[PDB]
């Protein structure tokens, strides 16, 4: 039995906080984007023929344009401000453990936000070669996780260090694994 | 690019499903419960720093639903092509026996936003402690969604996220066990 | 606390 879907998305794109801001208003019918308002262009543009009549109608409503063109300040920058303290400046400390899966796994879980640097050290010295990662996984509850793996046969008496740098710590976190 | 705030709305016929949500870098800030007509924050503490007047969302949905109807006739009732989900099961943090944890069922890259999802423990349904996100937007205009099941890690137990979607031939069953 | 702002859904042309 057939389905029909309409999507409307107002996207506020922020470059360096609120210095450069772009507004993207998108209408999507069954997975196909048909018409958009891009603050960079300053009027509605049909993406597909489906959306052509909507671009022409909306471009002739002067009030609507005037309003959208100021939304970059009235809407985008406004919401950024309302939400700064619990979105942009949200910080959760990663929980870092190291176990052998040979292959040494560094798990880094429960952190926010998404920018992180994970490094491995064999006896206090870097190991960029042999490093396998899952990539950044978004948990859906405002925490990320990642698992970073090192291919090495562990010779006992050696030290392996998982080093993790993250906006939630001033100096980096290191977990060691010996013998 | 640094950050993205998205006000995302959708309407699906003939199901008559409506959703209105705010997304920050891919995480939900809140969504509007259409039935109870109230703002539901993804994390309870967001309700301290911020408010949203739900009546504005209801208005947008009405318009979205009228737009969809007109748009449906213009496309001569072209229905949406089902796009089946990808499904990954994974845990909150690294699993340990007798230490509490959470199963995450991540459902991604599907369209029409309708799924039916059950967790099975040793082949049988579980619903104790379960929770779920609403449907979340993607840049290719498909959807993501998360299902959560708190559990006590054990050596016997096999778990399944069972996902039903019209884009699939048989329910997709995704294995997880503690090894 | 402080109020989040909304953009209104534009009505597509009738008929």
């Amino acid at each position, epitope marked *: 039995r057939p389905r029909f879907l309409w999507q409307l998305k107002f996207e506020c794109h922020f470059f360096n906080g609120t210095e450069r801001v772009r507004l993207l208003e998108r209408c999507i019918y069954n997975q196909e984007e048909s018409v958009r308002f891009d603050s960079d262009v300053g009027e509605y543009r049909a993406v597909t023929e489906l959306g052509r009549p909507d671009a022409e109608y909306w471009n002739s409503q002067k*009030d*609507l344009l005037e*309003q959208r063109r*100021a939304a970059v*300040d*009235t809407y985008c920058r*406004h919401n950024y401000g309302v939400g700064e303290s619990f979105t942009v400046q949200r910080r959760v400390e990663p929980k870092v453990t190291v176990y052998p899966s040979n292959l040494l796994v560094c798990s880094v879980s429960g952190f926010y936000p998404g920018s992180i640097e994970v490094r491995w050290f064999r006896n206090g010295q870097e190991e960029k070669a042999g490093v396998v990662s899952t990539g950044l996984i978004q948990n859906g509850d405002w925490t990320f996780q990642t698992l970073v793996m090192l291919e090495t046969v562990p010779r006992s008496g050696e030290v392996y260090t998982c080093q993790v740098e993250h906006p939630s710590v001033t100096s980096p976190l290191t977990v060691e694994w010996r013998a | 690019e640094e950050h993205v705030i998205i006000q995302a709305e959708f309407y699906l016929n003939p199901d008559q499903s409506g959703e209105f949500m705010f997304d920050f870098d891919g995480d939900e800030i809140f969504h509007v419960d259409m039935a109870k007509k109230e703002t539901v924050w993804r994390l309870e503490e967001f309700g301290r720093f911020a408010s949203f007047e739900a009546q504005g969302a209801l208005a*947008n949905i*009405a318009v979205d639903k009228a737009n969809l109807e007109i748009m449906t006739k213009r496309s001569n009732y072209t229905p949406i092509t089902n796009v089946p989900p990808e499904v990954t099961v994974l845990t909150n943090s690294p699993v340990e026996l007798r230490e509490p944890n959470v199963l995450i069922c991540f459902i991604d890259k599907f369209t029409p936003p309708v799924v039916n999802v059950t967790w099975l423990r040793n082949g049988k349904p579980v619903t104790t402690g379960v929770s779920e996100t609403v449907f979340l937007p993607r840049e290719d205009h498909l959807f993501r969604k998360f299902h959560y099941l708190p559990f006590l890690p054990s050596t016997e137990d096999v778990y399944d996220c069972r996902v039903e979607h019209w884009g699939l031939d048989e329910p997709l069953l995704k294995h997880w066990e503690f090894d | 606390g402080e109020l989040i*702002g909304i953009l209104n859904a534009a009505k597509v042309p009738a008929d």
Partner: T-cell receptor
Amino acid sequence: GVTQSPTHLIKTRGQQATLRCSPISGHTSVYWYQQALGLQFLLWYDEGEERNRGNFPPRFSGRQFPNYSSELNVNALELEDSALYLCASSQIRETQYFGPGTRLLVLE
Amino acid sequence: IQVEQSPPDLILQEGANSTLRCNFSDSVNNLQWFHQNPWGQLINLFYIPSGTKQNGRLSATTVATERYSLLYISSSQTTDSGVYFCAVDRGSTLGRLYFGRGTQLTVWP
């Protein structure tokens, strides 16, 4: 233009009033405002439905008809209810156009 | 939520120029200026969220980030007499204008 009836109305404390409004043809939204002793917002209708409502007792109530004209109805009138009641139509979040008002006086 | 107008009233002689001001305490999707004649008819002068607009002897400027609007009356005229309102379409509330208290203007010949 937006029209309103009636132009004036006198009412005794405790009676009830019905005010009428027609939006500009093409406009599908209707707004009621009260101007007493700067305007205060009462109610908003679009496509027959109460979309929103200001800070007024349930005594104040209304509705919009399928042809988009609307009725504001006030019920256990008080001396304080004396005001110019203004009606406006518009496309949502665009310019508002106002009718000539109903000048309503409530006396003892 | 709060909308301050200045001044509260004003008397001009025909030909004089002035500036009516409006200050507001939150982000505002759009801002509108009205003239209200003694009978009570409101007339829209400007829909202006940002920038500068001219219509004849009237012009207006809205600076959205700073949250004010100025209304310029060049070469004033007896017919300009009445009350001038800025009203404000608060970005977080759909379908509602919030009015200031007005600036009463009287222009004598």
